[model samples]
Target chain A: KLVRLPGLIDVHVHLREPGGTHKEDFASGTAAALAGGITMVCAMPNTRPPIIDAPALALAQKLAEAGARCDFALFLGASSENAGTLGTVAGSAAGLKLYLNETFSELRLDSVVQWMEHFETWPSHLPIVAHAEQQTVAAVLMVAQLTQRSVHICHVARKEEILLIKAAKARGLPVTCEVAPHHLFLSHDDLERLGPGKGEVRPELGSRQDVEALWENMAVIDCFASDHAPHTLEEKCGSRPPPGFPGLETMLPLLLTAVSEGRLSLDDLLQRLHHNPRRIFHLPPQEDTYVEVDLEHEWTIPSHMPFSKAHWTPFEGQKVKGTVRRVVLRGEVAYIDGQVLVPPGYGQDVRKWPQGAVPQLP
Target chain B: KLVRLPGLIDVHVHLREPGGTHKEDFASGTAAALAGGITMVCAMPNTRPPIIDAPALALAQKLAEAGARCDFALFLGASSENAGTLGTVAGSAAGLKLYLNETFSELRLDSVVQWMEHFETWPSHLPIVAHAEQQTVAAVLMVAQLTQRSVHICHVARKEEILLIKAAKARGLPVTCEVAPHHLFLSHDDLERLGPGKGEVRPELGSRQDVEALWENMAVIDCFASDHAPHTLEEKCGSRPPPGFPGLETMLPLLLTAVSEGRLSLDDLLQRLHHNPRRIFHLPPQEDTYVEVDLEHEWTIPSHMPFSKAHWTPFEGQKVKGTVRRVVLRGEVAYIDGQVLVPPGYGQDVRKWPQGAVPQLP
Candidate 1:
């Protein structure tokens, strides 16, 4: 029996390439995302060279075209070092990426105003994606207070931050936020299971209260991102690069399990993973993309199955019960029966600029 | 480099034999146990014909003498057809196995006095192995009320039952109990991860409060037992068997994880696995049996490396920091370097008639 559901649009992922290939690259990251039932995945620009300029964007476009398993888009980093280049990066694609909390490695609060002003100067139709955290929330809101830029929060992990974003939204500060599946399903209690070389990371697994709150906020979050950062199992266990475990391959299974257990609903999943990202990022409807999952098919979590080079995850062997039976990206079957069906290089590179004018090609 | 601890024992194991040999014979069961670093194992008498008579005991003896991997002992089933058969079975075992609670094909208490009378006459030195709560604690204790049998209560899954046993002990009732690693580590809270198939039993996974309470009662409890009842992953996923997900190989690693996290101490392990069972069941130490477990060895739970036909384990993929590195049976290295050195037939039959009552058969 076919369990048809609305396809998902993942708006946050770290397809590490151009430099951070050892940690995670675009190919493996997107493959894992498809395994998790995602059809359209947008990537965060924290790569080797960082997608801060045109040449880097071209390289990302080429890589996504050659290896990505789903519809893909890019978010360009806007920071102090690249503030002067905001005009070029913003003109290139989705929006300006502003790193609020120190995640991955770039784009801080000080550089958001320059990008925000550029959004303001443009025909007022561009999103300045903010990795909203303590460092950038207030500062970016201050810029939102002065400019016409729209702020879309990236990877909302903390519970209080959701309220902060809600308050910002209530105040008409032009803000939208995203919540990750890991942040929703796991709590601080998961730390004993994850910390110490199992699957650990910054902001650490939060308390049960925080996880519950994350679910409550997930009901209203604007976008859902896998942050499909691949990591080799060796590097994840190594002494360097202390971050949380990767989640792309696990995100859909975890979410579907939540839905099966009554903690979440399919409608909620559709809104967060598909509808919201399409609306927030203003991506066109996917007449060509969809994913099929069997809610009743149970499968044990596989070890070392993460397509990402970062082979570790907190949810490893966790026994997730739902199966992503098949995924059709751009009318091509990307995944079928626990296997990647579409050949490599079948993904489409996202390049349609928003209809309104912001900046033209140099 | 020597990581195995002083001694390791798995008290709950089903070596399908005398009938179900097609699934798992004693030779395979013992081999798997040794491979998992178990130095001693208490094989339950639940085979075909239920191991309720002298012939069944003889069969276990035959297997132990010609096939086992580690030092071995057997439990004599408590049956209603031959209330007087208790003495005969006890004569051939470490203790009389009473399924206090009704379970898969096991009898509940029918005549407590007749069974206890077996204990009363048995030189006052034998242990009455009670499968506590297999049917229910009340039924198990009903047998306890009739005789002054030194009892080894097995697999107390409920908190109230554990407290009942604690009160029984406090009243000088001569009762001692054991908890499995699964009961001590996971709870009903984990069933959410399974979505719906959480029916693994044998005093199955209980509430988180039950887990917390079991930990609290660990000191009062006699010892820890790995109810290493192996079943094919197919059988486990098939019709519910009123048994638990397997535990043999994971028992020590998990307890060690508890140790590394300070949830349990090495001394605690010593008491539960060695000192307690030794004193309670009255099993004498082997002439040269010991296990050396490195309390700090880090390892991942492997899915396919199990020894039992029941290849599935609930704890698979858990990164337990402590691992059993070596197991010595009668001074011979049975398990070393993650491999079993001895053949399947290397184990020796246990002496049923405790120290000095009967001579060791050569």
Candidate 2:
């Protein structure tokens, strides 16, 4: 007898297909997701040849259908060069993801004015997802308010950023946010312990007060995502380590441990994992999607167990007390007891919310 | 032909004289201080055999008198074992230096209560200087309130730390705090540019906000010190790099640049560097002590040009407009035009404040 829960949906993952497949491909990424009790993942489009146009989106969709084991959706990256193409690709992807700040890639708009101009012309029916720091987030929110467009902020980290998002939501600015597992579980102190190699991540970890702020404001957070960025161990531990960590296989276990330790409730975890993500993205719930877990199975995550090409995880050796026993995606068993049961190319393209189907807050 | 200013007093410097002489000895350390426009430096006691008792203090005084080219004062390390020795050595050393939090040595009190108890019985004439982070600062401030002892907090690097010190001063708790030059001139972003080896420093650099806060609250900040810790390049770039920088030579140049750039005023710089340190330590000002600088001599610091035995600084290749041309110690020229003008052993031992002569705040 296993504890049953709704299939988790992660809306922020870097499958690294098309360009950086040496680090992670759709096949391995979705397999890792399935093992972690996630049945669906929304892939970010900051790829080598980024998915900014209709043609690029089509190519990524074809690749996901040919290789992904779990259901997949794609985010079309926004840039000054591709700002005009949003209307043509709006219906095919999950949302428009804009980089108000630079990240691991060169895919960014030139200025906040360019971002504001693009937002002004973007299709209003689609949600706008933004990658920004606190100051940029404030600028984007002002532009968002002027354009009267709803936005979803990714990976809220700092205490100031959380306060801004909270105040924005309070003002009814149609702003929603998701907190990454790393931001919640780690702080700057961990950097000294993990050294520069494994400790570094995008938007560098915040102070202990920032970590505490995230926990304190967890009730207001719309969802949770792993930000499952994958990089080969050679890439991570080399002289110039890139800023990311693979979280596909560790997100659930870590959150489950949080629940067992009484940091959060099971209901809040499920809401962040499933209900809120579905509502925010306007996707309908699948009829037969569920995951079975052994809530009392205490174990330490092994260093070499991840299916992604980036085999190592920062969460290696972390002792957790819950394990995903089986995952059912679209009425079929996709993963069970440490083995993937689904075939490659089995996942279908995920559907977006019907035009004008935005969810309302109570 | 030379720019003139009052002799700067650096109350925090580490001359690893006895045990770690290979890294730095009193002779070279004072020479470095003279070249940096600093005529007096109070040495910390975390040496080979820590300076706690009267005999250790006398031995350090003898060594500094034999080799130091600048006026010197010594800080006694406090521990559970040395709590009773403060009275015996009260007049010889500058003040009591307590390591509320561990850095490089094993000279810490067992608990906060132990610190409070020790301060309770400490000689009333000597000021108690402490090295601590936020939580420890808060604890020490509370203990000072209870024991009615004046404490000098060293190397404040965080905004919260500054606020706590500010609040403590407002209540007249006899609390004074010093900000390090590295914290004012550099931050964590510099870490990426300098890499881990050169970027690292004790209490680690705070966020940009914290740096800005230090500048914003400059009026409330009591004094400025280099925390002029030194380690050889071989030790810093090795597998385990030490957590400090050689700051003596750069402190004045950097602060001078700040004055030239209009970031801070010459009056504020003089107050932080000279007036406050002399008054707080209870040392009488010398009539002929001063330093001359070439205020418009724009030059880049060479990598291999430090007088300290550590022989390296994090500010290598940094461009500046002001240069120290001469330093006068005890009415005699000690350093002139990048050369030593006086021999070692010319430095006199600094005296403590006379009993019942506490300087009042304006």
Maximum-TM-score candidate = 2
**Model 1 DockQ (Cα-based):** 0.00
TM-score of chain B of 1: 0.88
Summing lDDT over every window of 10 consecutive residues in candidate 2 chain B, give the lowest-scoring window.
B353-362
Clashing pairs in 2: none
- Predictions in order: lDDT: 0.67, 0.81
Q: Per-residue lDDT tens digits of candidate 1, residues A1-362? A: 75776667788777777787787666677777788887777777877778877788888888878877677777777655565555544644666676655644455432333444444543346567775553245445545544546667767777656655665565555678887767776777776666566555544556677677677766457766766556666766678745656777888888888888988778877888877887777766666677788888787776666466776566766777687888887677788876787755777755553432333344
Give per-residue lDDT, candidate 1, residue A261. Answer: 93
State each model's TM-score restricted to chain B: 0.88, 0.94
DockQ of each: 0.00, 0.02
TM-score of chain A of each: 0.88, 0.95
Report the lDDT tens digits of candidate 1 across residue range B194-237: 43343466676888888888888777777788766665666656
What CAPRI grade goes to candidate 1?
incorrect
